[PDB]
Amino acid sequence: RSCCPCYWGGCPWGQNCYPEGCSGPKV
Questions:
Q1: Rounded to the nearest 5°, which phi and psi values hold at 17?
Q2: Exposure of 1 by Cβ count < 10 A (0-12 exposed, 13-18 middle, 19+ buried)?
Q3: CA-CA-CA-CA torsion for 22, 8, 17, 25, nearest 10 degrees?
């Protein structure tokens, strides 16, 4: 799934779907 991990919400295999939640919803 895209959306990079929280700490790294700006990674290559994803976007910033975890800017304020390491386990919230997708974004």
A1: -90, -5
A2: exposed
A3: -10
DSSP assignment of 1-27 equals --S--STTTT-TTS-SS-SS-SSSS--
Render the burial of 8-21: b for 16+ CB within 10 Å, e for the rest.
ebeeeebeebbeee
Could you tell me which of 3, 10, 2, 7 has the C-alpha nearest to residue 22? 7
Experimental method: NMR
Two tokens, residue 4? 């990079």
